Design a protein around this ligand. Structure first.
Ligand SMILES: NC(=O)c1ccc[n+]([C@@H]2O[C@H](COP(=O)([O-])OP(=O)(O)OC[C@H]3O[C@@H](n4cnc5c(N)ncnc54)[C@H](OP(=O)(O)O)[C@@H]3O)[C@@H](O)[C@H]2O)c1
Ligand SMILES: NC(=O)c1ccc[n+]([C@@H]2O[C@H](COP(=O)([O-])OP(=O)(O)OC[C@H]3O[C@@H](n4cnc5c(N)ncnc54)[C@H](OP(=O)(O)O)[C@@H]3O)[C@@H](O)[C@H]2O)c1
Ligand SMILES: NC(=O)c1ccc[n+]([C@@H]2O[C@H](COP(=O)([O-])OP(=O)(O)OC[C@H]3O[C@@H](n4cnc5c(N)ncnc54)[C@H](OP(=O)(O)O)[C@@H]3O)[C@@H](O)[C@H]2O)c1
Ligand SMILES: NC(=O)c1ccc[n+]([C@@H]2O[C@H](COP(=O)([O-])OP(=O)(O)OC[C@H]3O[C@@H](n4cnc5c(N)ncnc54)[C@H](OP(=O)(O)O)[C@@H]3O)[C@@H](O)[C@H]2O)c1
Ligand SMILES: [Cl-]
Ligand SMILES: [Cl-]
Ligand SMILES: [Cl-]
Ligand SMILES: [Cl-]
Ligand SMILES: [Cl-]
Ligand SMILES: [Cl-]
Ligand SMILES: [Cl-]
Ligand SMILES: [Cl-]
Lengths: 255, 255, 255, 255
């Protein structure tokens, strides 16, 4: 545990498991008060909180289903209540847009319903979460969006997913120019394959694993800690001169 | 006289005016049969048809409202009927996804309805237009998506628009890998500022004019023919070894 | 044969064989007077000329060893003499920087001598060829540099070669901004593997072939015509709004 | 207090002043033993050493003229001697290729000597510095190449300089694939305008100042610490999953 982020308040969406959980634990380890958002798995969120507290950090869990904007509004209603109680204001410093879905389909298999849901959760929700954060973020804050190396490496069997993450990349680079006036940086992290349960079944196939492992310059799968450790830098004061950037965190996958 | 596209059949979406109309004229000049799609009133499209025919070319118009997928269905029902009678086949060769909208709003001004409409028209429609095209495209066909230089140059005042075009960019590179098995290429053209009747209000302010003029390395506004002339290469057999590419056609804007 | 480039004069470096020969034949086919430069293989250059003339075009061969700037100076002394005789001036319209070398070495195997030679031929010579072309090129001319997809796809066994082509890419994008004032476009073509004798021995190994073939979205090796057909567009008036761009002509290799 | 680099050994080239000196101070602050290389007179480097030591850190200086490969040889002969006595080993952990020059010239002003010197100092030297480093670098080491935003933003008035930095960019991405087998990462930092005593003449013109200031999304000139603070992340164990990347550290210049 250290004090790099002492005095700072972070919201991490989708922090009940996987990458978001790792990110949340790393930020709390560095001294931040962390809001652990969950979509519906409350007890997993509570576990993330428990782990943070066990290691001397401060965190709390709040739910919101982000599949509609009424969910975004709910996120901020709860965040406001908890932060007001704990800190005397509804202000915060670090926003991690991590929550997302990623089911596969080729273009010929993609239905309207599937497409619309991918957009609602992965592109629309982060945009509206940022929109509502603007009144709450302090100057010199940090916005980090979790994208995907699928925006750099062609995966036609995930085409709708890739498109939503392409929208996130353009959103990042575009907003960075406006929000730099307030000192707020906006960056994206593009993970490669990372052992989590968005891909537990996909990676269960040994062919798929071999492909996933060997594409990295380091000949291993990524771990949640690999992503969290880069997010910690982007969340910190040290990264003040890096904005609008799409940082690959794939272990040099497909160089 | 160019006969590069003799025997070819092309569909250009949103081709009543502006860039779409110019692409339609150019493709027809090169020998293609051109379906000129329009979203509302036929009169503009019918006048383009008359102009093409007066210059010795072949074209017809088809109306469909692409604000919903029902319009995509109607587009293809009409196209199938027209092509079967005109050519003995429902198959075609060249798909130009030009149809789109581009109103402005900063993130803080962007409503849910505004955002959903941008996605529906600019990302969802081209996606399902391609989906339905695949059973009709011949091998060695060409798909050209009209994107925007706004995906390379930050325009916060058009943020939802930019996001939609970034989604198109990712779709373009992703699908190219899949469709190469059929010799089909998929590319995007990224225009900068182009003079139309439609853009001529944003372009009325002489300050904005000066910015848009001198951003180009050639120090002039783009013209619809500048775009159409690059689309002609991408639609031709000569571009066979170029796929998945985002081709800037901005007169070297902001290099 | 056509007249797209009627009245235009082109110089193609390294046109005695391979890609440069293909480019030269395509430009002459479109009506250009083509200067066929060769390093030392005069009879192969004469064959390129013979082939062009057989198909109704106009061309001539001139030698210059580009391994030193005295070679560049010699190139232009001969070009000036021949063009003055044939046209009444030393002006021209299209410059193709194609000539180059590409032997392999990992970083640990690269000597100072090897490195220096790669730079002299592949980076320095094209820069100085362009420098000397500036007094000779008309307004609205075209500069096309042949680079390599090795600038996008990591090939550590060709590291010095890749670095020289990276320098070419930056040179292209940078000069485009200055030369746009005269209407002159500057672009690069990045080929993938193409069956020529820069890689005849490398591809003779069936393992290397399989890799070279299957990385393309089209599951074939590139042909010299694939490169020439893209160069014809970049050389033409149709490409006036495309400048500073690095155009992949690899058949969607490694998307 | 940061102890991120405790036990680590770093070499920073051209670290008498400017960015190199700032990186050296920061790395030493984080616990690294720092070799501070200088190209001419020792006094600047020795003063940095004194400053680091006064703040509790460990460092020493080594002189070598990197305008030739003989200087690279001399660098490593001195470094081997120093490290063996200081640490019991010739091995080290962190290589920062910062040494370079950056005089301006348009293409039409660029002499052969000017061009050759730029290559020798900016591309050839870092290449052979890495070559000689590989036998000395431990597994899980870090190589960080200081490049330039001029590879993303066209500066025709620095064209040879830009070309040299594009060569460094390509080398960075290419080598990352090779070196991942040893857990070694290779990345580049691309600064924008940074305030030094060295840049302060180009920056004296208030017109140029205004351009360089407002090009950033943060509307201020870069500072040496802005660069050093990102280098600290790339030098650390936390950046293990980031390799082959060109990280813009320009305060979001020209987004
Ligand atoms: N793992 C990879 O290989 C990989 C690669 C590239 C990018 N990524 C990206 O990394 C991020 C996290 O991925 P992950 O692998 O850690 O995912 P994961 O293990 O599936 O966890 C997803 C998280 O998102 C939340 N979430 C999902 N749908 C939601 C909804 N509709 N409303 C609110 N919250 C919702 C979940 O909350 P509940 O627990 O309540 O369901 C959960 O905390 C995503 O943006 C993903 O695209 C992952
Ligand atoms: N103009 C520029 O500077 C610029 C720059 C970058 C990108 N672009 C892109 O280029 C494309 C067109 O450029 P433009 O400026 O020439 O277009 P435009 O002049 O604005 O005309 C738009 C065309 O798209 C059709 N359209 C719009 N919404 C539609 C809908 N909902 N359903 C069906 N059709 C619809 C219209 O058909 P109707 O005639 O029936 O309305 C019209 O012909 C767009 O994708 C645009 O984003 C333009
Ligand atoms: N083929 C590929 O797979 C591939 C892939 C990517 C990029 N490229 C690029 O495409 C371009 C042409 O390649 P290629 O495969 O066609 O090469 P090639 O078959 O080896 O032909 C090279 C040409 O360059 C000329 N040349 C070589 N060294 C020279 C020198 N020192 N001075 C003057 N001229 C010299 C040669 O003239 P002489 O005949 O007199 O020797 C010859 O005409 C090069 O820039 C290359 O890097 C090729
Ligand atoms: N400053 C900027 O705005 C900017 C922007 C983009 C990139 N960069 C890059 O960042 C690096 C340094 O930036 P800077 O402006 O802080 O540097 P600087 O202030 O110009 O100082 C240059 C340093 O490099 C060393 N050096 C120069 N030529 C050398 C040679 N031939 N042999 C050995 N050492 C040599 C010098 O050592 P001595 O003290 O012994 O001379 C000096 O410490 C360069 O690679 C530069 O291109 C800077
Ligand atoms: Cl987990
Ligand atoms: Cl707590
Ligand atoms: Cl118009
Ligand atoms: Cl009609
Ligand atoms: Cl040949
Ligand atoms: Cl002749
Ligand atoms: Cl300084
Ligand atoms: Cl010392």
């Amino acid at each position: 545990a250290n004090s790099m982020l002492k005095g700072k308040v972070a919201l991490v969406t989708g922090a009940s498991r996987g990458i978001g959980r790792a990110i949340a634990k790393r930020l709390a380890n560095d001294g931040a008060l962390v809001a652990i958002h969950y979509g519906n798995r409350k007890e997993e969120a509570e576990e993330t909180v428990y782990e943070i507290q066990s290691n001397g950090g401060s965190a709390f869990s709040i739910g919101a289903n982000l599949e509609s904007l009424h969910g975004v509004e709910a996120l901020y209603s709860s965040l406001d209540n908890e932060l007001q109680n704990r800190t005397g204001s509804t202000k915060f410093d670090i926003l991690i847009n991590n929550a997302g879905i990623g089911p596969g389909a080729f273009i010929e298999e993609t239905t309207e319903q599937f497409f619309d849901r991918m957009v609602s959760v992965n592109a629309k929700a982060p945009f509206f979460i940022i929109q509502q954060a603007l009144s709450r973020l302090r100057d010199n804050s940090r916005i980090i969006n979790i994208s995907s190396a699928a925006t750099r490496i062609s995966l036609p069997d995930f085409i709708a997913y890739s498109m939503t993450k392409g929208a996130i990349n353009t959103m990042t680079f575009t907003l960075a120019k406006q929000l730099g006036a307030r000192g707020i940086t906006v960056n994206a992290i593009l993970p490669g394959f990372v052992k989590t349960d968005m891909n537990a079944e996909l990676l269960s196939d040994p062919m798929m694993k071999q492909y996933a492992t060997t594409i990295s310059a380091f000949n291993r799968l990524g771990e949640v800690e690999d992503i969290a450790d880069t997010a910690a830098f982007l969340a910190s004061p040290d990264s003040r001169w890096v904005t609008g950037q799409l940082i690959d965190v794939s272990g040099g996958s497909c160089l």
